[PDB]
Amino acid sequence: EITCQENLPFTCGNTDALNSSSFSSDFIFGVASSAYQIEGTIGRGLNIWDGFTHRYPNKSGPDHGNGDTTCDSFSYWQKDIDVLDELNATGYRFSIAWSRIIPRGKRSRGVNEKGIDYYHGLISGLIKKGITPFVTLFHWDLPQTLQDEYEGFLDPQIIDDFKDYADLCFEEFGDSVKYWLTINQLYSVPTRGYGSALDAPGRCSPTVDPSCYAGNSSTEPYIVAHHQLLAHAKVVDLYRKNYTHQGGKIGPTMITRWFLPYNDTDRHSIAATERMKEFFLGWFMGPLTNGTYPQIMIDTVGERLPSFSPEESNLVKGSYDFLGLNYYFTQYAQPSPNPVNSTNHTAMMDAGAKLTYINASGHYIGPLFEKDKADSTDNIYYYPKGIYSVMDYFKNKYYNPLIYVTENGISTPGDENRNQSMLDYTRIDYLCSHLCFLNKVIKEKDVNVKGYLAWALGDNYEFNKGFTVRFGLSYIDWNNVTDRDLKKSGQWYQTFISP
Amino acid sequence: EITCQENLPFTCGNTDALNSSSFSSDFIFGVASSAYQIEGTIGRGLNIWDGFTHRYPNKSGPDHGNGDTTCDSFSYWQKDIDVLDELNATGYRFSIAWSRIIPRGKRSRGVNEKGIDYYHGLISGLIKKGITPFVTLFHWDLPQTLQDEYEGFLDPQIIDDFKDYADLCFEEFGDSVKYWLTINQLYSVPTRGYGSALDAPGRCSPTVDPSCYAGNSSTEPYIVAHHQLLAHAKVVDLYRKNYTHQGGKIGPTMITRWFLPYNDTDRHSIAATERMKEFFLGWFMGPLTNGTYPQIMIDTVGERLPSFSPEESNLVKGSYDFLGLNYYFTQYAQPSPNPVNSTNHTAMMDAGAKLTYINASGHYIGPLFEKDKADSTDNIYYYPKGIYSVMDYFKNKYYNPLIYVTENGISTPGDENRNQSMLDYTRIDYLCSHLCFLNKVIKEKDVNVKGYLAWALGDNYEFNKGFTVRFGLSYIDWNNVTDRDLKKSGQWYQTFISP
Numbered sequence: 001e002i003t004c005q006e007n008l009p010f011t012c013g014n015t016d017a018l019n020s021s022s023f024s025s026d027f028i029f030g031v032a033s034s035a036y037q038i039e040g041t042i043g044r045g046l047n048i049w050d051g052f053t054h055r056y057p058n059k060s061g062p063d064h065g066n067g068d069t070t071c072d073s074f075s076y077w078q079k080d081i082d083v084l085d086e087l088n089a090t091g092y093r094f095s096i097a098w099s100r101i102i103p104r105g106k107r108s109r110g111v112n113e114k115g116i117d118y119y120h121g122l123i124s125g126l127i128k129k130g131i132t133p134f135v136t137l138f139h140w141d142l143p144q145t146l147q148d149e150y151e152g153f154l155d156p157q158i159i160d161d162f163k164d165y166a167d168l169c170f171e172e173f174g175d176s177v178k179y180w181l182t183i184n185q186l187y188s189v190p191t192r193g194y195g196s197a198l199d200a201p202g203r204c205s206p207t208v209d210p211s212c213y214a215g216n217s218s219t220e221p222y223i224v225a226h227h228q229l230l231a232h233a234k235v236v237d238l239y240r241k242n243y244t245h246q247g248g249k250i251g252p253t254m255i256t257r258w259f260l261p262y263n264d265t266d267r268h269s270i271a272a273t274e275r276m277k278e279f280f281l282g283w284f285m286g287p288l289t290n291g292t293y294p295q296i297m298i299d300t301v302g303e304r305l306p307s308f309s310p311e312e313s314n315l316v317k318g319s320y321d322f323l324g325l326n327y328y329f330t331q332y333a334q335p336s337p338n339p340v341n342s343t344n345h346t347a348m349m350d351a352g353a354k355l356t357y358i359n360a361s362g363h364y365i366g367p368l369f370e371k372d373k374a375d376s377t378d379n380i381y382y383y384p385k386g387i388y389s390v391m392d393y394f395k396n397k398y399y400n401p402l403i404y405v406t407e408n409g410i411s412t413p414g415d416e417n418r419n420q421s422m423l424d425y426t427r428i429d430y431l432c433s434h435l436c437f438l439n440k441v442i443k444e445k446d447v448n449v450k451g452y453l454a455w456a457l458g459d460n461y462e463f464n465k466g467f468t469v470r471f472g473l474s475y476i477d478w479n480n481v482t483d484r485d486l487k488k489s490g491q492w493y494q495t496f497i498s499p
Numbered sequence: 500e501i502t503c504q505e506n507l508p509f510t511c512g513n514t515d516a517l518n519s520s521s522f523s524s525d526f527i528f529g530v531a532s533s534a535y536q537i538e539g540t541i542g543r544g545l546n547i548w549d550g551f552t553h554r555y556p557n558k559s560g561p562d563h564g565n566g567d568t569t570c571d572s573f574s575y576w577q578k579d580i581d582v583l584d585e586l587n588a589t590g591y592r593f594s595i596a597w598s599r600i601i602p603r604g605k606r607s608r609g610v611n612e613k614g615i616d617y618y619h620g621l622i623s624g625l626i627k628k629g630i631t632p633f634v635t636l637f638h639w640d641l642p643q644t645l646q647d648e649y650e651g652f653l654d655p656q657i658i659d660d661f662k663d664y665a666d667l668c669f670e671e672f673g674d675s676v677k678y679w680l681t682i683n684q685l686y687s688v689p690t691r692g693y694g695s696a697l698d699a700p701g702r703c704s705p706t707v708d709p710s711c712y713a714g715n716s717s718t719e720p721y722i723v724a725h726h727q728l729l730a731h732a733k734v735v736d737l738y739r740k741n742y743t744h745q746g747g748k749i750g751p752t753m754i755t756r757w758f759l760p761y762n763d764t765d766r767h768s769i770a771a772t773e774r775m776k777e778f779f780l781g782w783f784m785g786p787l788t789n790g791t792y793p794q795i796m797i798d799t800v801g802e803r804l805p806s807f808s809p810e811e812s813n814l815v816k817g818s819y820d821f822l823g824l825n826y827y828f829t830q831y832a833q834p835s836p837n838p839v840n841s842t843n844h845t846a847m848m849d850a851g852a853k854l855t856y857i858n859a860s861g862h863y864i865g866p867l868f869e870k871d872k873a874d875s876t877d878n879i880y881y882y883p884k885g886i887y888s889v890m891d892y893f894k895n896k897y898y899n900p901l902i903y904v905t906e907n908g909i910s911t912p913g914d915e916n917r918n919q920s921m922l923d924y925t926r927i928d929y930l931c932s933h934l935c936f937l938n939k940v941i942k943e944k945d946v947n948v949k950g951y952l953a954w955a956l957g958d959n960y961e962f963n964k965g966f967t968v969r970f971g972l973s974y975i976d977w978n979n980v981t982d983r984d985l986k987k988s989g990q991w992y993q994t995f996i997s998p
C-alpha cells in the first residue's frame with residue numbers, strides 16, 4: 001500500500017523510498033522544453049510570440065524579457081543533450097518552431113533547409129544517447145505571416161497550413177520521431193490569446209484590455225478552440241493515413257487541473273466544480289472522445305459555440321493515439337455570475353465559476369506554487385493529489401486513454417542569486433510529491449500512464465514572465481548562457497532515475 | 500566668393516563665418532530619424548527588420564543589437580520634440596512604421612487606431628513648435644506578413660498593399676503633413692536586402708552567403724528595384740490625384756554618392772566612374788525622369804532587367820514633386836570584371852567597377868568617415884565637395900529638381916565613453932564642411948535645394964551595426980534611454996541655426 005504526502009514537509013526526495021524502479025520497467029522519465037522558450041530567433045522567421053512580446057513588452061514579462069536569445073539552444077542544443085545524458089533520461093519533449101522550418105508559414109513558399117538540418121541533428125543526437133523524442137509540432141509559435149494574413153487560428157485557413165507543416169515534419173523527421181504532439185495545451189491560446197489577451201496574439205474585447213489590437217473575448221475563444229480541434233484532427237488523420245509505416249503515435253496536449261468545491265457541502269459550489277471540469281477539460285475532451293462539445297457548454301454558450309458537421313465530428317472523435325497531459329495545480333470552484341451582455345464578457349465567464357486556492361473555511365489547498373508580489377492574495381498553491389485525481393478522471397471519464405505526463409514543474413524566483421537558485425529544494429518537493437501520487441494512481445487505479453516529462457530541462461524564457469522566474473532542473477546564467485548546470489533538483493532527479 | 504575646405508583641419512564650425520543666415524531665409528534646417536531605429540516594438544506588429552535581426556543576429560550588428568527597445572521614442576516622442584525645440588529646428592524627418600498602423604500589412608485586415616494616434620500626437624506636437632514634418636512612408640520596415648505571404652517587394656502584389664497603406668497615411672495625416680517621402684534610399688533594399696543579404700529581408704544566391712534562406716543576387720535586385728519604382732509611382736499618382744487638396748509635395752529618397760576616377764588619366768577608370776553614376780544614380784533617376792532605365796544598364800543587364808510597359812513608363816516618369824537626397828560619401832571607381840555566369844554573381848557587379856577611398860597614386864579622398872576594425876583597408880573616408888558635385892549633377896542631368904537633403908551625418912564609435920561621445924568634434928567638422936559646400940553649390944550653381952536634415956536626431960539602432968556606433972546630435976544612455984542630451988555637435992548646430 002502506497003501512502004503519499006499532501007503537505008509540507010515531504011520525505012519523498014529520498015530515493016531509497018521513491019525512485020524509477022517504483023514504476024514499470026518501460027516507463028519513460030525525462031524533461032520538456034519548447035522552441036520559443038529556448039532556441040532564440042537566429043536562423044528562423046518571426047512568429048506571433050516575437051510579435052506579441054515586441055508590440056506589448058509589458059505583457060512579455062515584468063522585465064520585458066523575450067525569446068530573442070534566451071538560452072540559445074540554437075547554438076547549444078548539444079549542451080541540452082548533455083543534460084539529458086547526465087540525467088540518464090529516456091525521454092525529451094521539445095517543439096519544432098514552425099517559423100524555423102517554414103519561415104513564410106505556407107509550405108508552398110519554400111522550406112528552410114538549414115532549419116530542417118537543425119532538428120535532424122538534435123533528433124539524431126538524442127537517439128544516439130538512448131533518449132526518446134516527444135515532439136510538439138505547435139507550441140504556440142505561429143508564423144507571424146499567418147496571423148497577419150488571416151489571424152491565424154481565428155480562420156479556417158489555418159487548417160490546411162497546419163496540415164502542410166505537419167506533413168513536412170512527418171516526412172523529414174518521422175523515420176526517427178515516434179511520439180508526436182500536435183498542439184500544446186489546447187485551452188491556453190483560446191483563452192489567454194483571444195480572451196484575456198495575456199498571451200499571443202493578444203486579441204480581446206476593447207473593454208477587457210484597451211491595448212488589444214482587435215478581438216472579441218466572448219466569441220473568439222470558441223472559434224479558435226474549434227479551429228484548433230479541426231486542425232489537430234486533420235493532422236492526426238494525415239499521420240495515421242499517410243505515415244502509418246513510421247510506427248509512431250500522435251496526440252494532443254491538454255493542460256489539466258483538478259477542481260474541488262470551494263465549499264464541499266454547498267450544492268452550488270459542487271455544481272460549479274463539475275461545470276469547471278466540463279468547461280476546462282471537456283471543451284476539448286468531449287470533442288476528442290465523442291465528436292461533440294459538453295452539453296453544459298452547448299446550453300450555456302448557445303450561438304457562440306460552433307457546430308461540427310457530421311464529417312468534422314467523425315474526424316475529431318478518436319483523433320489521438322495517446323494524450324499528453326500537462327499538470328501543475330488544482331483549484332477550488334465556487335459559483336460566479338455569467339454576464340453575457342456585459343461589454344467585458346469573456347468566454348471564461350461562461351463556466352459560471354470563480355477559482356481560488358483557499359476554500360470557504362480558509363484552508364489553502366497545499367504548498368506555495370507561485371508567489372504574486374503585486375497581489376499576495378493571488379498566490380498560487382499546489383496540490384499533489386491532483387495528479388492522482390486527474391489521471392483517475394481521465395481513465396474513468398475518457399475511455400482509459402494512453403497517457404504521457406508531458407509537463408509538470410514549479411518555478412523559483414529570478415530574484416534569487418545563483419546559490420539560492422541551485423538550492424532548489426522546493427522543486428524537489430514538488431516533483432517528488434507528484435511522482436509519488438502518479439505511482440499511486442497507476443498502481444491503484446490502473447491508469448495507462450507510460451511516461452513523465454518534467455518542466456523544464458533548463459531555465460528559459462517563461463511565457464508572460466520573462467526571466468523573472470526559473471523552471472529549470474538545470475541552471476542557466478543569463479550573462480553567459482552556454483552551460484546548463486544541474487541544480488539540486490536535477491541531481492535528485494538523476495538519482496531518482498538511476499537509484 | 501565662397502571658399503570651402505576639403506581637408507582637416509576645418510574652420511567652418513565658427514558660426515561667425517557659417518550659419519543659417521548664410522542660406523536663404525526660408526531654408527529648412529533640422530534632423531532625421533526612422534521608425535525601426537527609434538521607436539521600439541511596443542504597440543506595433545512585426546516587420547522584416549525584426550525578422551531579420553532575430554533570425555540572423557550576427558547581421559543585426561556586432562553586438563547583436565536590434566530595434567526592440569532602442570531609444571524608446573514610442574514612450575519618449577515628446578523628448579524628441581524637445582530636442583528639436585532646443586535646436587530651433589524648422590524640419591524633422593521621421594518615418595511611419597507600417598507595422599504600427601497596419602500590423603497585418605493589408606489595410607482591409609484592419610488598422611491600429613492607437614498607432615494612428617501615436618503619429619497624430621507626434622505631428623501635432625511638431626507643428627505646435629513650428630517644426631515642419633518630412634514623413635517617410637517606408638523606411639525599410641515592411642510588415643513581416645507581407646514578406647512571408649509573397650516576399651514583399653519581390654512580388655507585384657506589393658504595389659497595391661503599399662498604395663493602400665499610403666492612402667491611409669494621406670487620409671489620416673495629410674491635413675498636417677505637407678512633405679512626404681515614399682521609399683527610403685531606393686538603391687539599398689535591392690542591393691543589400693536582395694543582393695548581398697546584409698540587410699532585411701536577407702535574400703541572396705546560395706554561394707554569396709549560405710545563410711540566406713532563398714534568393715538570387717543576380718536577378719532579384721532588379722526585380723525589387725522595379726517594384727519599388729512602380730509602388731512609388733502608384734503612390735505619387737494617388738497623392739497627386741486624390742490628395743491635391745492637401746497642398747503638399749511628395750518624392751522618393753535617393754542615396755547619393757559622388758564618383759571620381761581611381762585614375763583620372765586612365766580612360767578605363769573614367770569609364771567605370773561614368774558607369775557608376777548610371778548604375779547607382781541612374782538606375783532610379785532614369786526611370787524617374789524619363790521612364791526608362793539607362794542605356795548602359797539595358798545593354799549590360801539584358802534579360803535580367805525588367806521592362807516598363809508604356810503605361811508604367813508614363814506612371815513612373817515625373818513621379819516626384821521633389822527629391823530627398825541622402826548624401827554621406829564619395830568613392831573612386833576603377834574597372835572590374837562582370838562574371839555573369841559565376842554562381843556568386845551579384846547585380847552590383849554589373850556596373851563593372853571596383854570602389855575605393857584611395858586613388859591610384861595613394862591619395863585618400865578625405866577625412867575618416869568610418870573605421871572598420873576587422874579590416875582597416877576597408878575604412879570609409881568622406882569628401883565634403885561631393886555634396887557640391889552631387890547637387891550640381893542632379894541639376895544638370897536630372898532637370899533642375901527641387902531637392903531637400905534628407906540625411907547627412909557621421910558616426911562615432913560606441914566604444915567611446917560618454918564624455919568622449921559628447922565631445923563629438925569630428926561630427927561638427929563633418930556637418931559644417933558639408934554645409935559649407937551645400938551653400939556654395941546653391942550660390943554658384945543655383946541648385947534648388949530648400950532644406951537640410953542631418954542624420955540623426957539622437958543615438959539609435961544603426962542598421963547592420965547595432966549600438967556599436969552612434970550617429971546622434973544628441974546622446975542617449977542605453978542604460979536609461981529617457982534623456983536625449985545635445986552633444987557638442989547639437990550645441991554647435993543650435994548656434995548655426997540661431998547665430
Ligand SMILES: *[C@@H]1O[C@H](CO)[C@@H](O[C@@H]2O[C@H](CO)[C@@H](O[C@@H]3O[C@H](CO[C@H]4O[C@H](CO)[C@@H](O)[C@H](O)[C@@H]4O)[C@@H](O)[C@H](O[C@H]4O[C@H](CO)[C@@H](O)[C@H](O)[C@@H]4O)[C@@H]3O[C@@H]3OC[C@@H](O)[C@H](O)[C@H]3O)[C@H](O)[C@H]2NC(C)=O)[C@H](O[C@@H]2O[C@@H](C)[C@@H](O)[C@@H](O)[C@@H]2O)[C@H]1NC(C)=O
Nearest residue numbers: 286287289290291292293294295296298299302307308313
Ligand atoms: C455524444 O455525441 C452524441 C451525438 O453523436 C450526443 O447525443 C446527441 O445529443 C444531442 C443533444 O446534445 C441530441 O440532439 C438533440 O436531439 C433532440 C432530438 O431530435 C431528433 O428528434 C428531434 C427531436 O424532437 C428533431 O428536431 C431532430 O431533427 C431529431 O429528429 C433535439 O431538439 C436537440 O436540439 C435542441 O437542442 C440543441 C442543444 O442540445 C440546440 O442546439 C438545438 O437548436 C435544439 O434547440 C438536439 O438536436 C441537436 O440539435 C442541434 C443540431 O446541430 C444537432 O444536429 C441536433 O442533433 C442527439 O439526439 C443525440 N444523438 C444521439 C444519436 O443520441 C451525446 O450527448 C449526450 O447524450 C445525449 C443522449 C444527451 O443526454 C446529451 O445531452 C449528452 O450530452 C454525446 N455525449 C456526450 C457525453 O457529450
Ligand SMILES: *[C@@H]1O[C@H](CO)[C@@H](O[C@@H]2O[C@H](CO)[C@@H](O[C@@H]3O[C@H](CO[C@H]4O[C@H](CO)[C@@H](O)[C@H](O)[C@@H]4O)[C@@H](O)[C@H](O[C@H]4O[C@H](CO)[C@@H](O)[C@H](O)[C@@H]4O)[C@@H]3O[C@@H]3OC[C@@H](O)[C@H](O)[C@H]3O)[C@H](O)[C@H]2NC(C)=O)[C@H](O[C@@H]2O[C@@H](C)[C@@H](O)[C@@H](O)[C@@H]2O)[C@H]1NC(C)=O
Nearest residue numbers: 785786788789790791792793794795797798801806807812
Ligand atoms: C528616354 O526614353 C526614350 C523612350 O521614350 C529613350 O529613347 C528610346 O531609346 C530606345 C533604346 O533604348 C530606342 O529603342 C530602340 O529602337 C530601335 C528602333 O526601333 C524602331 O525602329 C525599329 C528599328 O529598326 C523596330 O524594330 C522597332 O519596332 C521600332 O520601329 C530598336 O531595335 C531597339 O531595340 C534593340 O535594342 C533594345 C536595347 O536598347 C533591346 O532591348 C531590343 O531587344 C533590341 O535588341 C530599341 O527598341 C526598344 O527595344 C526594346 C523594346 O522593349 C522597346 O519598346 C523598343 O523601343 C527608342 O527608339 C527610343 N525611342 C525614341 C522615341 O527615341 C531614350 O533613350 C535615349 O535616347 C535614345 C535616342 C538612345 O540614344 C538611347 O540609347 C538613350 O538612352 C531615353 N533617354 C534616356 C536619357 O535614357
Ligand SMILES: *[C@@H]1O[C@H](CO)[C@@H](O[C@@H]2O[C@H](CO)[C@@H](O[C@@H]3O[C@H](CO)[C@@H](O)[C@H](O)[C@@H]3O[C@@H]3OC[C@@H](O)[C@H](O)[C@H]3O)[C@H](O)[C@H]2NC(C)=O)[C@H](O[C@@H]2O[C@@H](C)[C@@H](O)[C@@H](O)[C@@H]2O)[C@H]1NC(C)=O
Nearest residue numbers: 261262263264265266267268269270334359360361362363
Ligand atoms: C458551506 O455551505 C453551507 C451550505 O450553504 C453553509 O451552511 C449554510 O450557511 C448558511 C449561512 O450562510 C445558513 O443559513 C443561515 O441560517 C441562519 C440560521 O437559521 C439564518 O439566520 C440565516 O439567515 C441563514 O439562512 C438562510 O438565509 C438565506 C435564505 O435564502 C436561506 O433559505 C436561509 O438558509 C444555512 O443554514 C447553512 N446550511 C447548512 C445545511 O448548515 C456553510 O456555512 C457555514 O456553516 C453554517 C452552519 C453557518 O455556521 C455559516 O456561518 C458557516 O459559514 C458553508 N461553510 C462555510 C465554511 O462557508
Ligand SMILES: *[C@@H]1O[C@H](CO)[C@@H](O[C@@H]2O[C@H](CO)[C@@H](O[C@@H]3O[C@H](CO)[C@@H](O)[C@H](O)[C@@H]3O[C@@H]3OC[C@@H](O)[C@H](O)[C@H]3O)[C@H](O)[C@H]2NC(C)=O)[C@H](O[C@@H]2O[C@@H](C)[C@@H](O)[C@@H](O)[C@@H]2O)[C@H]1NC(C)=O
Nearest residue numbers: 760761762763764765766767768769833858859860861862
Ligand atoms: C594612370 O593611368 C595611366 C594610364 O593607364 C598610367 O600610365 C600608363 O602606365 C602604363 C604602366 O601601367 C604605361 O605602360 C607601360 O609603359 C612602359 C614604358 O613603355 C612599358 O615598359 C610597359 O610594358 C607598359 O606598356 C604597356 O604594356 C601593356 C600594353 O598592353 C600597353 O600597350 C603598353 O602601354 C603607359 O605608358 C602609361 N601611359 C601613359 C599615357 O603614361 C599611370 O601609370 C603611372 O604613370 C606611368 C607613366 C608609369 O610611370 C606607371 O608606373 C605609373 O603607375 C596610372 N597612374 C597611376 C598612379 O597608377
Ligand SMILES: *[C@@H]1O[C@H](CO)[C@@H](O[C@@H]2O[C@H](CO)[C@@H](O)[C@H](O)[C@H]2NC(C)=O)[C@H](O)[C@H]1NC(C)=O
Nearest residue numbers: 205206207215216217218219303304340343344
Ligand atoms: C462579440 O460578438 C458577439 C456576436 O457578434 C456580439 O454579440 C452580439 O451583439 C450584437 C449586437 O448586440 C447582438 O445583436 C447579438 O444578439 C449578440 N449576439 C450574441 C451571439 O451574443 C458582442 O457585441 C461582441 N462583443 C464585443 C465586445 O464586440
Ligand SMILES: *[C@@H]1O[C@H](CO)[C@@H](O[C@@H]2O[C@H](CO)[C@@H](O)[C@H](O)[C@H]2NC(C)=O)[C@H](O)[C@H]1NC(C)=O
Nearest residue numbers: 261262263264265266358359360361362363364
Ligand atoms: C476546506 O478544506 C478542508 C481540508 O480539506 C476541509 O477540512 C476537512 O474536512 C473534513 C470533512 O469535514 C474533516 O474530516 C477533515 O478533518 C478536515 N481537514 C482538516 C485539515 O481540517 C474542509 O471541510 C473544507 N471546507 C469546505 C467548506 O469545504
Ligand SMILES: *[C@@H]1O[C@H](CO)[C@@H](O[C@@H]2O[C@H](CO)[C@@H](O)[C@H](O)[C@H]2NC(C)=O)[C@H](O)[C@H]1NC(C)=O
Nearest residue numbers: 704705706714715716717718802803839842843
Ligand atoms: C539566377 O536566375 C537566373 C535567371 O533565372 C539564373 O540564370 C540563368 O541560369 C539558367 C540556368 O543556367 C540559364 O539557363 C539562363 O541562361 C540564365 N539566364 C540568364 C537571364 O542569365 C541564374 O542560375 C540564377 N542564379 C542563381 C544562383 O540561382
Ligand SMILES: *[C@@H]1O[C@H](CO)[C@@H](O[C@@H]2O[C@H](CO)[C@@H](O)[C@H](O)[C@H]2NC(C)=O)[C@H](O)[C@H]1NC(C)=O
Nearest residue numbers: 760761762763764765857858859860861862863
Ligand atoms: C589622386 O588624387 C590626387 C588628389 O586629388 C590627385 O593629385 C592632384 O593632381 C592634380 C593634377 O595632376 C595636381 O594638380 C594636384 O596638385 C594634385 N593634388 C595633390 C594633393 O597631389 C592625383 O592626380 C590623383 N591620382 C590619379 C592617378 O588620378
Ligand SMILES: *[C@@H]1O[C@H](CO)[C@@H](O)[C@H](O)[C@H]1NC(C)=O
Nearest residue numbers: 015016017018019021022499
Ligand atoms: C527503489 O524504491 C523502492 C521502493 O519503491 C525500493 O524498494 C528500492 O530499494 C529503491 N531502490 C534503491 C536502489 O534504492
Ligand SMILES: *[C@@H]1O[C@H](CO)[C@@H](O)[C@H](O)[C@H]1NC(C)=O
Nearest residue numbers: 055056057058210211541542
Ligand atoms: C502597458 O502597456 C500598454 C500598451 O501596450 C498600456 O496600454 C498599459 O497601460 C501599460 N500597463 C501599465 C500597467 O502601465
Ligand SMILES: *[C@@H]1O[C@H](CO)[C@@H](O)[C@H](O)[C@H]1NC(C)=O
Nearest residue numbers: 163234235237238239241242
Ligand atoms: C496523402 O498523401 C497523398 C499524396 O500526397 C495525398 O494524395 C492524400 O490526400 C494525403 N492524405 C491525407 C491527409 O489523408
Ligand SMILES: *[C@@H]1O[C@H](CO)[C@@H](O)[C@H](O)[C@H]1NC(C)=O
Nearest residue numbers: 207208339342343344345346
Ligand atoms: C467588468 O469586469 C471587471 C472584471 O471582469 C469587473 O471587476 C467589473 O465590475 C465589470 N464591470 C461591469 C460593468 O460589469
Ligand SMILES: *[C@@H]1O[C@H](CO)[C@@H](O)[C@H](O)[C@H]1NC(C)=O
Nearest residue numbers: 477479480481482483484485
Ligand atoms: C562562458 O561560459 C562558458 C562555459 O562555462 C565558458 O567556457 C566561457 O569562457 C564563458 N565566457 C566568458 C566570457 O566568461
Ligand SMILES: *[C@@H]1O[C@H](CO)[C@@H](O)[C@H](O)[C@H]1NC(C)=O
Nearest residue numbers: 020087088089494497498499
Ligand atoms: C542508466 O539507466 C540504465 C537503466 O536503468 C542503467 O542500467 C544504467 O546503469 C544507468 N546509467 C547511469 C550512468 O546511471
Ligand SMILES: *[C@@H]1O[C@H](CO)[C@@H](O)[C@H](O)[C@H]1NC(C)=O
Nearest residue numbers: 514515516517518520521998
Ligand atoms: C552669419 O554668417 C555670415 C556669413 O555667411 C556672417 O556675415 C554673419 O555675421 C553671421 N551671423 C552671426 C550672427 O554671426
Ligand SMILES: *[C@@H]1O[C@H](CO)[C@@H](O)[C@H](O)[C@H]1NC(C)=O
Nearest residue numbers: 042043554555556557709710
Ligand atoms: C553568423 O551566422 C550565420 C547563421 O545565420 C552563420 O552562417 C555564420 O557562420 C555566422 N558568421 C560568423 C562569422 O560566425
